[PDB]
A paper describes a structure:
The bases of the bound ssRNA interact with the side-chain atoms of Arg32, Tyr90, Lys117, Gln124, and Ser128. Although these residues are not conserved in ZmASCH at the same site, potential polar residues (Asn122, Gln124, Gln127, and Ser128), which might possibly interact with RNA molecules, are found nearby (right). Based on these simulation results and extensive analysis of amino acid sequences of related proteins, we introduced a charge-reversal mutation at the site of Lys53 (K53E), within the positively charged surface cleft. This mutant exhibited reduced binding to ssDNA and ssRNA molecules. Another mutation at Ser128 (S128A) also decreased the binding of ZmASCH to nucleic acids, although to a lesser degree. Mutations of the two independent residues at the positions of 47 and 128 did not make a noticeable structural change.
In the ethanologenic bacterium Zymomonas mobilis ZM4, the gene ZMO0922 encodes a 148 amino acid polypeptide, which has been annotated as a putative ASCH domain-containing protein (ZmASCH) that belongs to family 23. Here, we report the three-dimensional crystal structure of ZmASCH which confirms the fold of a central β-barrel core and reveals a positively-charged cleft with a pocket on the surface. In vitro assays showed that ZmASCH bound nucleic acids and possessed cleavage activity specifically towards single-stranded RNAs. The weak nuclease activity of ZmASCH depended on magnesium ions and the protein appeared to prefer the consecutive pyrimidine-adenine dinucleotides for its cleavage activity.
Author numbering: 4 to 145
Write the structure that this text describes.
Amino acid sequence: IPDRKEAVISLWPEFAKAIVSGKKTVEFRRRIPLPALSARIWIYATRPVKSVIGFAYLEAIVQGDVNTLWSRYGREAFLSEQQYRDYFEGTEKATAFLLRDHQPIRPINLDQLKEIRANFQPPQALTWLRKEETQKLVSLTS
Ligand SMILES: [Cl-]
Ligand SMILES: [Cl-]
Ligand SMILES: [Cl-]
């Protein structure tokens, strides 16, 4: 049973790159199941990259009102007010993940990930990694 110190998240490639390059230090999600505070977040870029391209660490978790969060962290989130607004339409509470110590790596493609976890689907929210899985992911890291 995973302890949520190791997790994977899915982003579109432009946002995934902004993160592994240290540009985007905030990720907004709805109220989803939470990682551990001290977690490594491995960053999975969707099509056409279809790879894990780095990781980053979680310096803080913020939940609160949608307007407040944009006002406070929206610039660090690298998306536009419109995108944020369309996404959080229909809810009043958001989650902000504050990120630090980003690390670009060379891409671990989707085939290698199904080699580590047989039925890997790219996470709609976060997926927690097993111990055995983390070791393999790390082994491929470069
Ligand atoms: Cl959701
Ligand atoms: Cl709500
Ligand atoms: Cl709620």
